[PDB]
Design a protein around this ligand. Sequence first.
Ligand code: NA
Ligand code: NA
Ligand code: NA
Ligand code: NA
Ligand code: NA
Ligand code: NA
Ligand code: NA
Lengths: 241, 98
Amino acid sequence: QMNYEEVIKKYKGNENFDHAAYDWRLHSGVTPVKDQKNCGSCWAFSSIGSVESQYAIRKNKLITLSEQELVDCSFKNYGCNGGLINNAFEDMIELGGICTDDDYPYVSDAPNLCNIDRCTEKYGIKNYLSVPDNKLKEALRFLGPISISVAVSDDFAFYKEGIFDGECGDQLNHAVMLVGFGMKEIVNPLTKKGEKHYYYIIKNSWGQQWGERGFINIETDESGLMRKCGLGTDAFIPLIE
Amino acid sequence: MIPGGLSEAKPATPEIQEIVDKVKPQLEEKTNETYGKLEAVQYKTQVVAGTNYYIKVRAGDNKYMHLKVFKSLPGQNEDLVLTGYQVDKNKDDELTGF
Ligand code: NA
Ligand code: NA
Ligand code: NA
Ligand code: NA
Ligand code: NA
Ligand code: NA
Ligand code: NA
């Protein structure tokens, strides 16, 4: 219901951008990774993760919200077997809020209920936003991380340390959060040139200790549209302000 | 086109992809019968925090069914169990979901 058209006036419209490197994991914003096991709730995970980040940057509150709350109280979304990231923020804007990960649990592939009276804490948003297919780095910093998607495959899931210069999935079927960007200094095996291997630090809603704690970084560029595995596409960010 | 969820009707696999017939030791819990290596027909897939397959089977009176046989991550390596069974189905009842 609100967009980028008048949101960069309050952060960086009249300013400059380090087109290289900014991990929001390292600047008091990124919250502990949470797992979803065998019940598709990636969308709901990224929703609460992004709201966690917003609170964590402003008043610096390491509060964590729940993901089964938006698996049972998903009105215009589907549920624990699929769902969209943007129409969860709107259900959250009308209902009133999500209950903390203690005040309301996640049980993965298991039937569960919804009560919006298992909490007394007022945790909600006022507007959400969409970021274009290119400003994933430009709007990652002054606005905050972006609930994005990635093409999931066995290649994407090879969870070692490195820049992901590999293949991807055949459909945009997994929601994640873009949590930063960076650069690396490697050399060519012929002329030992410092190949500038920039990347996107991308989180996984799987919450596993997947590679870099649950953050596989993928090969991207100084600008941000070469993004492989559809790194972006359906990119959404909430705003408590 | 939606994040980590309902896929589309997938036809079938090549000669190898034998998640179809791992039913023999895993129906033993509650769907145990002489129903061994149940006859699967059409397939589908899903993603959560790992691989989540789907198989439409036949069982009993040639009565069809659906199977939430879900795979996962390689802590050890390969693992899959029917995280839900439902044997009141037909070929038309395919692999709706949930
Ligand atoms: Na809009
Ligand atoms: Na190379
Ligand atoms: Na391009
Ligand atoms: Na698009
Ligand atoms: Na396989
Ligand atoms: Na008969
Ligand atoms: Na059919």
